[PDB]
RNA sequence: UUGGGGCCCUUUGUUUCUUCUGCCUGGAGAAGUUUGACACCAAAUUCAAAUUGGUGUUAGGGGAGCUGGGGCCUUUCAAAA
RNA sequence: AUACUUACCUUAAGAUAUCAGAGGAAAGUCCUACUGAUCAAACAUGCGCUUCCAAUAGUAGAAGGACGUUAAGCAUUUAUCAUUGAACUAGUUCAUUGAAGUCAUUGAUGCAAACUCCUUGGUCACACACACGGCGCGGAAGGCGUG
RNA sequence: AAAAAAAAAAGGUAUGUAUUAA
């Protein structure tokens, strides 16, 4: 080509060649102007409603929907939930397990290995001060240690100091296991 | 996202075709991104140049959507 | 430069009235005070009539959806 | 300079451009002179030792 | 911003919703002009909203013309105008000399016992005496074309950025009109403003 | 994708247009977006009838636009590498 | 508030206030009660069917569909019925959707 | 994103029209677009076709009357040679690529219109476009007013004769030995 | 919720795709694309007759269907049979399933149920 | 190793995997094969080499070894009837 | 390739088959080269699976083209609007003024034929063999199945 | 009885200037 108003030379712009100009055909289309999708819409007749009828007598009942009750299911039983924890709700002076004394004195254990044994729990526990009472928890249906205990001192600031001791850092090693501590939480 | 590069047109007397046949005629004064092109002092061209030719108003603003094809008569 | 919609809220705060094209199918275009605007260009004009393409009929305070405009002339 | 500098750039900022041109110049010869002056000086320098 | 619509509306809502800032009826506020360049950075205070500023400006119009904003506007931008300034002092300051006079003393040395030789035999004397200098003025004019490989430049009072006589004006066109010098030029045109 | 690549890839460039209108614009393409909307310099112009005029630069919109023809010499382009080997992003 | 800024669970829950509160309860109400419904599609003719789903862009899964389209030429009018089992239908066709008594 | 340029190969980062628009304008990626694009040019000239061939039976009317045809004797040049017989044939091609024969604008130098027509930088058509087509020209003419009234006698001692018509390099010995008339 | 995820499980089907254009298509259902785009194996697809003594069918509905290359020389009516159409997503209008397949079954949507399963 | 016959030689740059030698009264010989070699394109200088930036080629066939898969046969074992 | 100067600019988000069961850190989540089912991809590998793969016992033929000729082929239909004056029937011709005006009329539309030329194929092997509709070697394109 | 500090440039493209041989 001539000019070339281009980033490149003459070679290589004369190398791009484009195919000769497109030949003329005459539109089969409609014109862009005279486009438009079908008007004069009927709308929703009276005499439409009217129709409806033959519809509704052949057809009375619809098939019922199956695919609702799926879901209808699963939050049924999400209410059902909620219910088991009201169940549980109503549920710390009346459990006895946990009437042990004072609870400013209870420091609750956690993470605890189930085969753990009171004695080494005594002497962790034991460590922080002297030991009031304890108690470890236990499934009621059955005697599998839940992993969890309470422990009364003698002071509460020996409690407060296992707290922060044993279970400020990393968890205090029983066993093979780091165990949580802190406050009675109930 | 991207504003369309309109940027060596404005100020400029540009004809512009609104939908299949209208084409309006004004001087480009701004542009927005959906090609919105507002103008001023804008002109109806219609057959006869003098006699159907109508101006619309003092300024007059386009939706992008009913531009097809813009031509700047001008440098 | 002066972007389009800032022209058009000078269209609202000035209260100058204004013609407004529709799509070539329809065949009315309305005119009235533009009051307000949102991002789709569809606006909101008081005390607007349509007109055939002057006998037109007044229609009110009135939203008009921005798929239709085709011009807003003063 | 106008016609190599007006290809490229719009015509709108080719004034303001051209008269920051100006002025970069004119601070060119500036510079220049005080040069020529502080040769000058060590000339002098040289001459009374 | 990931859709036309999104950045509209957040046009539209920048048109449609003491905040003081942008004021002087051209353009200006010192942060707007530098954004993603290297010098200022990101939030900035107050909001420069073009609804308060549609009401500004069509208050010049209304010629209600109050020059607080102006009488706060020369405490923000003199402040720029001094930082620019100073930051031409430090490049003078950085700029001229390096290791750099050394070798000029170095050449000097190779001017001194030239220049003495004269008074040593004081025809022939004066003229070894005037190659002598002739060959120390070369000599310093080497040193300082060598000075000037290192830097040749001079800084714009404008931008604080340096300026190479040698690379004519047409390259120099690209500083012109980049965001930084054009910013500072329209910042000392509003000092001006500001002084009447 | 590769299709506005390679249109992209066209500036500068002899292309012919085919608008829904039905007209024909065929000429030197100088910008080019990725909403497909180009402008054109120095082209002529077929209208849907047929009456061909010429003008000197024009923008259209991609929405409007059908069919653009590219030079043939494109078609090996590197955009259409099926298996290629990029080295590894700078990182910033 | 734009829908860009709200995380990935706001959007269901915006979805499903949409769809239990507001216009398009007038479908979901529908659904539920197996009440049928009339359909205006843009192609100018009209279905009175039953929903078994729909969805935000308005496209539903319908369960006895029976269409109903007239034509005519020069003022010759003719009035067509086509019954269908079950259908799919894409929302970009509707304009007007009404709940039967 | 990231805008690779897998012409220069090396990516630019976080696409911008800005700097995308001045990479794709830059000079490097110029010079190392325009030979990618020469080299995949030439090589379509350079592949050979190799279409399969397709070998039927001779027929036993055709290899009778082919037998009585005497064998034609066949040339085949050596490697040495083939080389550069190929070298010139393809400096040939690119020859007969770049001649574009202009003579007719040499014929008209002096016409009145000259100035209008066949300077292309001032025309009307292209002439506008010369001046963007202009190179950024970073660092580092014939007015189209002219009027007939200069050179009013194209012959004053200012003409050189047209150029003689060129002959093939080849049958260079086929011209006629002597001319018809003497010339200075 | 996407109905269109519906359309992805009826894969290897017998349906109509009948589109905006009036045409019809009868065919073997594959892979539904997120646009809706459909991909059909063995179809038939042609044009109604509108009677009303003889009112003039889609004038651009023929042209594209004589122009897939599948329309025999010796159809009577106005029909084409071929393999492989790839149909864009936007041109769809109704689509009929068989009367077979059970909806309680294949309108469950898992993502739905995953919500509400998680929650 | 020689002779005779048949078909092919468009392999058109006379077997196209390179390079070098070479051929129709012949189908050949030498070197080489992927951190490499070769061909080609582009430049500006130097002034015929290289320099820098790019595109492409490095092939086909058979056999031995080794290894993956399949079908069939014989033997040994486990379960069931 | 290195150094300096100037200009232009910087991270949509998340994820990598599903379902179910068992286990580890009442609810939920994460995880298990854990167990099953289904799905998908790649790679192998099979089916008396389906279709196709050109004359030399001759100067052919099949598919697809010509943006090829005959060819001004044959048969049809088309060549601007407005204003003023003169004549004219009761629309027509001529002259002047203004506006736009793809080229074509050897055109465009319809109809049909003849000719010429291009690209493509296993131009393979065995066979010139009186049957009731096979079980040669490969290549191309599919469908189905196992691993 | 109580007390006191922080760790950082990034790197892409383009333009101009200088260097890399008889
Ligand atoms: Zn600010
Ligand atoms: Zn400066
Ligand atoms: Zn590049």
């Given at each position: 080509m001539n000019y070339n108003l281009s980033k490149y030379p003459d070679d290589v712009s004369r190398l791009f060649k484009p195919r000769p100009p497109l030949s003329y055909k005459r539109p089969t289309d409609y014109p862009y102007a005279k486009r438009q999708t079908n008007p004069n819409i009927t709308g929703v007749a009276n005499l439409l409603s009217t129709s409806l009828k033959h519809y509704m007598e052949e057809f009375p009942e619809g098939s019922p929907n199956n695919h609702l009750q799926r879901y209808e299911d699963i939050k049924l039983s999400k209410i059902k939930n909620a219910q088991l924890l009201d169940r549980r709700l109503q549920n710390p002076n009346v459990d006895p397990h946990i009437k042990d004394t004072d609870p400013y004195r209870t420091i609750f254990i956690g993470r605890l290995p189930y085969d753990l044994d009171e004695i080494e729990l005594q002497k962790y526990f034991v460590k922080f001060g002297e030991i009031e009472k304890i108690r470890i928890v236990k499934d009621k249906i059955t005697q599998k240690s839940k992993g969890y205990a309470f422990i009364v001192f003698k002071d509460p600031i020996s409690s407060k100091m296992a707290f922060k001791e044993i279970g400020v850092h990393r968890g205090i090693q029983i066993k093979d296991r780091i165990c949580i501590v802190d406050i009675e939480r109930g | 996202v991207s504003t369309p590069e309109l940027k060596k047109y404005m100020d400029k007397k540009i004809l512009l075709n609104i939908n299949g046949s209208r084409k309006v005629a004004g001087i480009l004064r701004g542009y927005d991104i959906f090609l919105n092109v507002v103008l001023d002092d804008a002109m109806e061209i219609n057959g006869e140049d003098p006699a159907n030719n109508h101006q619309l108003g003092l300024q007059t603003v386009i939706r992008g959507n009913s531009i097809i094809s813009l031509e700047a008569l001008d440098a | 430069m002066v972007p389009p919609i800032n022209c058009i809220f000078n269209f609202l705060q000035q209260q100058t009235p204004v013609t407004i094209w529709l799509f070539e199918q329809i065949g009315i275009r309305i005119k009235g005070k533009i009051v307000g605007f949102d991002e789709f260009m569809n606006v909101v004009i008081d005390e607007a009539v349509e007109i055939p393409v002057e006998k037109g009929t007044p229609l009110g305070k009135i939203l008009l959806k921005?798929?239709?405009?085709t011009l807003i002339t003063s | 300079a106008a016609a190599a500098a007006a290809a490229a750039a719009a015509a709108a900022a080719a004034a303001a451009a051209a008269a920051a041109a100006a002025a970069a110049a004119a601070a060119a010869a500036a510079a220049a002179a005080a040069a020529a002056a502080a040769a000058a000086a060590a000339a002098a320098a040289a001459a009374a030792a | 911003m990931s859709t036309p619509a999104a950045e509209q509306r957040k046009l539209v809502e920048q048109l449609m919703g003491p905040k003081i800032?942008?004021?002087?009826?051209v353009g200006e506020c010192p942060y707007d002009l530098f954004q993603g360049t290297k010098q200022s950075l990101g939030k900035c205070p107050q909001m420069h909203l073009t609804k308060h500023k549609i009401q500004y400006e069509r208050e010049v119009k209304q010629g209600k013309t109050f020059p607080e904003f102006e009488r706060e506007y020369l405490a923000i931008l003199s402040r720029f105008v001094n930082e620019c300034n100073g930051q031409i002092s430090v490049a003078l300051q950085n700029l001229k000399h390096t290791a750099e006079e050394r070798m000029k003393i170095q050449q000097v040395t190779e001017e001194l016992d030239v220049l003495d030789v004269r008074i040593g035999l004081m025809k022939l004397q004066e003229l070894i005496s005037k190659r002598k200098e002739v060959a120390k003025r070369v000599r310093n004019i080497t040193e300082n074309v060598g000075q000037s490989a290192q830097q040749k430049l001079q800084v714009c009072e404008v931008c604080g950025a340096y300026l190479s006589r040698l690379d004519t004006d047409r390259r120099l066109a690209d500083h012109f009109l980049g965001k930084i010098h054009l910013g500072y030029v329209k910042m000392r045109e509003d000092y001006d403003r500001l002084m009447k | 994708g590769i299709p506005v690549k390679l249109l992209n890839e066209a500036q500068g460039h002899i292309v012919s247009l085919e608008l829904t209108t039905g007209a024909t614009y065929r000429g030197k393409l100088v910008e080019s977006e990725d909403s497909m909307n180009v402008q054109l310099r120095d082209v002529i112009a077929t209208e849907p009838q047929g009456a061909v005029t010429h003008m000197d630069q024009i923008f259209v919109r991609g929405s409007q636009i059908k069919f653009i023809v590219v030079p043939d010499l494109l078609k090996n382009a590197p955009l259409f590498k099926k298996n290629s080997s990029r080295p590894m992003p700078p990182i910033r | 508030r734009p829908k860009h800024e709200l995380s990935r669970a706001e959007l269901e829950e915006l979805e499903e206030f949409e769809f239990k509160h507001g216009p398009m309860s007038l479908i979901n109400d529908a659904m539920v009660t197996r009440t049928p419904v009339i359909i205006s599609l843009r192609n100018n003719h009209k279905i009175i069917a039953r929903v078994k789903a729909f969805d935000r862009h308005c496209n539903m899964v319908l369960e006895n569909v029976k269409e109903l389209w007239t034509e005519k030429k020069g003022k010759n009018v003719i009035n067509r019925e086509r019954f269908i089992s079950k259908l799919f239908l894409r929302g970009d066709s509707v304009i007007v959707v009404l709940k039967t008594p | 994103t990231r805008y690779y340029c897998e012409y220069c190969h090396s990516y630019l980062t976080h696409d911008t029209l800005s700097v995308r628009k001045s990479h794709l304008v830059g000079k490097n990626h110029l010079r190392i677009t325009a030979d990618y694009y020469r080299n995949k040019a030439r090589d379509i000239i350079n592949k050979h076709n190799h279409k399969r061939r397709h070998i039927g039976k001779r027929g036993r009317k055709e290899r009778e009357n082919s037998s009585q045809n005497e064998t034609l004797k066949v040339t085949c040049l050596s490697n040495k040679e083939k080389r550069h017989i190929m070298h010139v044939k393809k400096m040939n091609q690119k020859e007969l690529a770049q001649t574009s024969i202009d003579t007719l604008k040499l014929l008209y130098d002096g016409s009145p219109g000259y100035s209008k027509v066949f300077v292309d930088a001032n025309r009307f058509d292209i002439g506008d476009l010369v001046k963007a087509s202009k190179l950024p020209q970073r660092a580092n003419s014939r007015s189209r007013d002219e009027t007939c009234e200069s050179n009013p006698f194209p012959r004053l001692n200012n003409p050189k004769k047209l150029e003689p018509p060129k002959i093939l390099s080849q049958w260079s010995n086929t011209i006629p030995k002597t001319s018809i008339f003497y010339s200075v | 919720m996407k109905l269109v995820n519906f359309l992805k499980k009826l894969r290897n089907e017998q349906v109509t795709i009948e589109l905006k254009n009036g045409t019809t298509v009868w065919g073997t259902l594959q892979s539904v694309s997120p646009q809706m785009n459909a991909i059909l194996t063995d179809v038939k697809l042609t044009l109604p007759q509108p009677r009303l003594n003889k009112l003039n069918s889609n004038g651009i509905a023929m042209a594209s269907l004589y122009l897939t290359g599948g329309q025999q020389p010796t159809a009577s009516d106005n029909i084409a049979s071929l393999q492989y159409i790839n149909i864009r997503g936007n041109t769809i209008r109704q689509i009929i399933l068989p009367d077979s397949l059970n909806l309680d079954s294949l309108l469950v949507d898992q993502k739905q149920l995953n919500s509400l399963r998680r929650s």
């Open positions: - | - | 921005g798929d239709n405009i | - | 800032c942008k004021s002087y009826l | - | - | - | -």
